[PDB]
Amino acid sequence: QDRETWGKKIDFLLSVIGFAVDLANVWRFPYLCYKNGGGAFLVPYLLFMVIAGMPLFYMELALGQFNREGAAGVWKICPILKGVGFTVILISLYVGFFYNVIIAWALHYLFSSFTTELPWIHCNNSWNSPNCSDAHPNDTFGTTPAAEYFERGVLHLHQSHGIDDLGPPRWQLTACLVLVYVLLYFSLWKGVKTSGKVVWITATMPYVVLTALLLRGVTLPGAIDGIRAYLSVDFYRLCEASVWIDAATQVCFSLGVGFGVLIAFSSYNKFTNNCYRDAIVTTSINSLTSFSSGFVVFSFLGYMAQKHSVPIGDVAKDGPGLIFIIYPEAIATLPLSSAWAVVFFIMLLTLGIDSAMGGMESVITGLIDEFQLLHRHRELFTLFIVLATFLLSLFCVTNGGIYVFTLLDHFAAGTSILFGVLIEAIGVAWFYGVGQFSDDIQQMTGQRPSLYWRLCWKLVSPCFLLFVVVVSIVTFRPPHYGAYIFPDWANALGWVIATSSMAMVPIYAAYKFCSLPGSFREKLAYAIAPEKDRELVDRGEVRQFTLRHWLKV
Ligand SMILES: CC(C)CCC[C@@H](C)[C@H]1CC[C@H]2[C@@H]3CC=C4C[C@@H](OC(=O)CCC(=O)O)CC[C@]4(C)[C@H]3CC[C@]12C
Ligand SMILES: CC(C)CCC[C@@H](C)[C@H]1CC[C@H]2[C@@H]3CC=C4C[C@@H](OC(=O)CCC(=O)O)CC[C@]4(C)[C@H]3CC[C@]12C
Ligand SMILES: CC(C)CCC[C@@H](C)[C@H]1CC[C@H]2[C@@H]3CC=C4C[C@@H](OC(=O)CCC(=O)O)CC[C@]4(C)[C@H]3CC[C@]12C
Ligand SMILES: CC(C)CCC[C@@H](C)[C@H]1CC[C@H]2[C@@H]3CC=C4C[C@@H](OC(=O)CCC(=O)O)CC[C@]4(C)[C@H]3CC[C@]12C
Ligand SMILES: CNc1nc(C#Cc2ccc(Cl)s2)nc2c1ncn2[C@H]1[C@H](O)[C@H](O)[C@]2(C(=O)OC)C[C@H]12
Ligand SMILES: COC(=O)[C@H]1[C@@H](c2ccc(F)cc2)C[C@@H]2CC[C@H]1N2C
Ligand SMILES: CCCCCCCCCCCCCCC
Ligand SMILES: *[C@@H]1O[C@H](CO)[C@@H](O)[C@H](O)[C@H]1NC(C)=O
Ligand SMILES: CCCCCCCCCCCC
Ligand SMILES: CCCCCCCCCCCC
Ligand SMILES: CCCCCCCCCCCC
Ligand SMILES: CCCCCCCCCCCC
Ligand SMILES: CCCCCCCCCCCC
Ligand SMILES: CCCCCCCCCCCC
Ligand SMILES: CCCCCCCCCC
Ligand SMILES: CCCCCCCCCC
Ligand SMILES: CCCCCCCCCC
Ligand SMILES: CCCCCCCCCC
Ligand SMILES: CCCCCCCCCC
Ligand SMILES: CCCCCCCCCC
Ligand SMILES: CCCCCCCCCC
Ligand SMILES: CCCCCCCCCC
Ligand SMILES: CCCCCCCC
Ligand SMILES: CCCCCCCC
Ligand SMILES: CCCCCCC
Ligand SMILES: CCCCCCC
Ligand SMILES: CCCCCCC
Ligand SMILES: CCCCCCC
Ligand SMILES: CCCCCCC
Ligand SMILES: CCCCCCC
Ligand SMILES: CCCCCCC
Ligand SMILES: CCCCCCC
Ligand SMILES: CCCCC
Ligand SMILES: CCCCC
Ligand SMILES: CCCCC
Ligand SMILES: CCCCC
Ligand SMILES: CCCCC
Ligand SMILES: CCCCC
Ligand SMILES: CCCCC
Ligand code: NA
Ligand SMILES: [Zn+2]
């Protein structure tokens, strides 16, 4: 049987929008806007989005749609550079070991909200230390009843001495995790017919909840101060070299490229689809969602800062668990706080689940495409992948699970994402040929891309990605959680996994070069030439050997 397609185009659009829209998308852009700049942070962000943010999205969508294969089989245009598909598959697999525990924490918090007394209001109970002090006129948000609850009565962090004292897993978090994985499996087992229909609810509820919170948040005292702090113009901030680095890193990391998800999602699209309009619409929606969500979150942050009589700089911080500490404290003061907590955690759960589903779907699709023996049994392979991910994600459930979560979050994606994106971009734009790519896009859609797209694909994007990779590998900082310093072997293991996700390109390159028969010239010709050019290569007319193809744009 031939490849199946999306039931409706709205399914594909909602799938990509839901995967791209993330919990980090809600916070990262507004936090960066407040930290350096404000209204002046939109200049570097928009500049980099135009220069090298849209071309990568468009190229990934077009490649996936035209080649009609997953992340690994899409590389018939350059067989030697096939290890990129395995690299992105490994990257997607690694991220699945802690996103699910994030969703499990959110789901556990959701269950403990159907009560008239939410268990983070006061601090007269069993799981609170005698150092509780919630003062309402030096860590002002440390030892808060909400923070103490999250750290002791949920995570049980105080019973671990570090990453060497994990201890047995907790059964409540394990039950939440198994519920999450059951949801994931039953949402991913029947191909894309049912995975594109479940997205209809998990990609439209967060917007409703965000609208409700914006309606509630604005009326709070001190919210206008938070919004003013969020959006304040300061053009002198553009003279520092850190604002541009932050903008470039955020543009690279918020797109969703590098996981091989957009290739698999667009692989099921019809051959006559219009990927240009789809890329434009998805990028615009994902960019505006961050703006609206920032309005909401900074209104709430301003209200909390006014309540605690502290500057907004102390409230606005980046860390794991602060989402479960500040806002739940803010929610409890409002009347009918149970409903607000319920909707808050429902929105969190949906935001997590859509992205986790997309990330697992990328791996499943790529591995199914690569090997034909698994194509006849998709449900069993999905069950095996889910079981493996669930077994390898049981470490974040233990008492010292926050340390493992921090290490994995620091090292899993890192520079590996940028290296994979750079390698795939340079491969597509140089080895295959930007002219051939434009011809394929014209055949697929009908209108050939203009000179701007070709220039951005060929010249600007590889240079921007290389600069991002270098600046990310130069300013590396070891991970930490509060006043905890990770052991040296933990950093070594993090670097080992980060390199292992990246060290598949040379391995496959060497294996493919040694496997092909002939001399050096024959091996190179069969390796670096497209599959469809086999007849020309046999005659001895390889286009890559000529330098005119290399210097063509
Ligand atoms: C309840 C209120 C307060 C919030 C509602 C939020 C969502 C229901 C909306 C917000 C933005 C909408 C999107 C905005 C733009 C488009 C483009 C629109 O046009 C197409 O791309 C046409 C595709 C086709 O031909 O089917 C398709 C729906 C979509 C994704 C919308 C789907 C529904 C979304 C997610
Ligand atoms: C990317 C994939 C492969 C997941 C990687 C997860 C790591 C962060 C895990 C996998 C192996 C784990 C180690 C396996 C064995 C142990 C012994 C263990 O010994 C104890 O003190 C607890 C013993 C017990 O459970 O009773 C302490 C944690 C540690 C170092 C673990 C720390 C966390 C590690 C490195
Ligand atoms: C909200 C999400 C994350 C989890 C819950 C989703 C389930 C309620 C849905 C998703 C997939 C659905 C299934 C998808 C396909 C089928 C096969 C279908 O059987 C047929 O008639 C076609 C196949 C056959 O001939 O067996 C019957 C409904 C069923 C079991 C569906 C029942 C409802 C399911 C389990
Ligand atoms: C930060 C918030 C407030 C808005 C963010 C939205 C942007 C990420 C989107 C919205 C409209 C998009 C643009 C819509 C149309 C085009 C035209 C397109 O260029 C052409 O078609 C050729 C024009 C030429 O010849 O220069 C290149 C992409 C671009 C700039 C898009 C880039 C991405 C943009 C700026
Ligand atoms: C104030 N502090 C934080 N607030 C928030 C928020 C929020 C709201 C959304 C809608 C509202 Cl309404 S409020 N998000 C944070 C914070 N600090 C880290 N994050 C992210 C980071 O991306 C990090 O990667 C992360 C994580 O590790 O979560 C377990 C995913 C969180
Ligand atoms: C840690 O990586 C992420 O959270 C990325 C992405 C994602 C990829 C894989 C995954 F399993 C779950 C989520 C979801 C979105 C798009 C890219 C980025 N997130 C901002
Ligand atoms: C924690 C993992 C949960 C996986 C989902 C449990 C149900 C598995 C059902 C398998 C059906 C296979 C299709 C028929 C062979
Ligand atoms: C709070 O008091 C406890 C006493 O059990 C002590 O162990 C802890 O270090 C104190 N924390 C701070 C921040 O003072
Ligand atoms: C039995 C205690 C119920 C507490 C209130 C819960 C309200 C949930 C419904 C609103 C969100 C849909
Ligand atoms: C959490 C509930 C799990 C129930 C599992 C039922 C599996 C049904 C498979 C039907 C195959 C035709
Ligand atoms: C919480 C998810 C529960 C999913 C139950 C699916 C049951 C499938 C029955 C199939 C009968 C033909
Ligand atoms: C989609 C439904 C939105 C309803 C939002 C209501 C929020 C409470 C308003 C309180 C005004 C004082
Ligand atoms: C809150 C997000 C709203 C985003 C609205 C974007 C609408 C784009 C429509 C494009 C039609 C061609
Ligand atoms: C669709 C439901 C969104 C959340 C509604 C919460 C209940 C608000 C009732 C009015 C409060 C004054
Ligand atoms: C002390 C009880 C520990 C239970 C762990 C959860 C079961 C794991 C099954 C693989
Ligand atoms: C210790 C009493 C409760 C046991 C629960 C067993 C199931 C946990 C999730 C698999
Ligand atoms: C046929 C169009 C369906 C649009 C997505 C579902 C909207 C649900 C609104 C709550
Ligand atoms: C893109 C140019 C941005 C210039 C910002 C203002 C610089 C002021 C220098 C005194
Ligand atoms: C009083 C300030 C109100 C701000 C509203 C912002 C709306 C952003 C688009 C949904
Ligand atoms: C939870 C384990 C379920 C395993 C699937 C059912 C047996 C399939 C044998 C081919
Ligand atoms: C012969 C039928 C089962 C073949 C194996 C299916 C995938 C199992 C996990 C690799
Ligand atoms: C991919 C090659 C670079 C590996 C990381 C940088 C060297 C170690 C720095 C501590
Ligand atoms: C007092 C003005 C409230 C405005 C709420 C947001 C309207 C879109
Ligand atoms: C710290 C930035 C170094 C940039 C080197 C050149 C990259 C193109
Ligand atoms: C991004 C546009 C900022 C303009 C500020 C004018 C006061
Ligand atoms: C000492 C307890 C061991 C539990 C193992 C669970 C996988
Ligand atoms: C208090 C949380 C209990 C979770 C039970 C999941 C079945
Ligand atoms: C064709 C039936 C689709 C149901 C979608 C429910 C959200
Ligand atoms: C590609 C990495 C080059 C070396 C970076 C550290 C100097
Ligand atoms: C203290 C040494 C621990 C080694 C762990 C290797 C995974
Ligand atoms: C000629 C092929 C070179 C591939 C190198 C990959 C890093
Ligand atoms: C994968 C690195 C070694 C390859 C050897 C091929 C003979
Ligand atoms: C739209 C950016 C902020 C203007 C004050
Ligand atoms: C994760 C890829 C391993 C080789 C198929
Ligand atoms: C007062 C305008 C704020 C941005 C819409
Ligand atoms: C992770 C192994 C996939 C099948 C070779
Ligand atoms: C998943 C591997 C199947 C046998 C080559
Ligand atoms: C606790 C999980 C052990 C097998 C991966
Ligand atoms: C068949 C190739 C698997 C990865 C080296
Ligand atoms: Na998401
Ligand atoms: Zn307080």
Author numbering: 58 to 194, 205 to 620
Paper quotes:
Dopamine and the dopaminergic circuits in the brain are intimately involved in mood, reward, motivation and movement. Widely used therapeutic or illicit drugs, such as methylphenidate, amphetamines or cocaine, target the human dopamine transporter (hDAT), perturbing or inhibiting dopamine transport and thus disrupting dopaminergic signalling. The hDAT is a member of the neurotransmitter sodium symporter (NSS) family of transporters, which in turn belong to the larger family of SLC6 transporters, integral membrane proteins that harness ion gradients to achieve concentrative reuptake of small molecules by way of an alternating access mechanism.
Δ-hDAT exhibits dopamine transport and [3H]WIN35428 binding activities similar to the full-length, wild-type transporter. Collection of a large single-particle cryo-EM dataset and extensive image processing, which included ab initio-based 3D classification followed by non-uniform refinement, ultimately yielded a cryo-EM reconstruction of Δ-hDAT at 3.19 Å. The Δ-hDAT structure resolved here, bound with multiple inhibitory small molecules and ions, adopts an outward-open conformation where the central ligand binding site, also known as the S1 site, is accessible to bulk solvent via the extracellular vestibule. The Na+ ion is coordinated with the main chain oxygens of V78 and L418 on TM1 and TM8, respectively, and side chains of D421 and S422 on TM8, with a mean coordination distance of 2.3 Å. Buried underneath EL4 and sandwiched between TM1b and a short helix of EL4a, the MRS7292-binding site (MRS site) can be divided into three subsites: the ring clasp (I), the adenosine sandwich (II) and the thienyl anchor (III). The Zn2+ ion is coordinated by H193 on EL2 and H375 at the juncture of EL4a and TM7, with Zn2+-to-nitrogen interaction distances of 2.3 Å.
